[PDB]
Design an enzyme around this catalytic site. Sequence first.
Site, PDB file in Angstrom:
ATOM      1  N   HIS A  99      -9.330   6.734   2.035  1.00  9.58           N
ATOM      2  CA  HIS A  99      -9.445   6.544   3.506  1.00  9.58           C
ATOM      3  C   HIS A  99     -10.783   6.203   3.760  1.00  9.58           C
ATOM      4  O   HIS A  99     -10.928   5.465   4.684  1.00  9.58           O
ATOM      5  CB  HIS A  99      -8.856   7.713   4.126  1.00  9.58           C
ATOM      6  CG  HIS A  99      -8.172   7.249   5.606  1.00  9.58           C
ATOM      7  ND1 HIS A  99      -8.180   6.238   6.160  1.00  9.58           N
ATOM      8  CD2 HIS A  99      -7.559   8.023   6.517  1.00  9.58           C
ATOM      9  CE1 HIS A  99      -7.657   6.146   7.224  1.00  9.58           C
ATOM     10  NE2 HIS A  99      -7.277   7.323   7.411  1.00  9.58           N
ATOM     11  N   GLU A 133       0.959  -1.431   0.000  1.00 15.44           N
ATOM     12  CA  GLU A 133       0.142   0.079  -0.116  1.00 15.44           C
ATOM     13  C   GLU A 133       0.778   1.218  -0.128  1.00 15.44           C
ATOM     14  O   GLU A 133       2.118   1.281   0.248  1.00 15.44           O
ATOM     15  CB  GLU A 133      -0.941  -0.029   1.177  1.00 15.44           C
ATOM     16  CG  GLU A 133      -2.120   0.898   1.029  1.00 15.44           C
ATOM     17  CD  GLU A 133      -1.854   2.250   2.136  1.00 15.44           C
ATOM     18  OE1 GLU A 133      -2.147   1.940   3.225  1.00 15.44           O
ATOM     19  OE2 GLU A 133      -1.486   3.307   1.196  1.00 15.44           O
TER      20      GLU A 133
END
Length: 88
Positions: free
Chosen positions: A84, A58
């Site tokens: 997010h 990530e």
Amino acid sequence: MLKLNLKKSFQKDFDKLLLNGFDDSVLNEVILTLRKKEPLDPQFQDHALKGKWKPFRECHIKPDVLLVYLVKDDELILLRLGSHSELF
């Protein structure tokens, strides 16, 4: 620079996500750093995720972006793109 790739996920998470209620105005910033030549920095907390996303990497190019990719032999591959609020 290293090689770049794209998966079925990133393909639909890139342009198919933009029109899926995603702020395309923010992509111009992240896609501008990856589609130019500037490689991701180690200060982006880039590493292996936890859980089912163990065999992946990530990297939040932006405070509201989370692009996933894999590290291959002298070659890079784009996994998918999220946020997010999305990935969570």
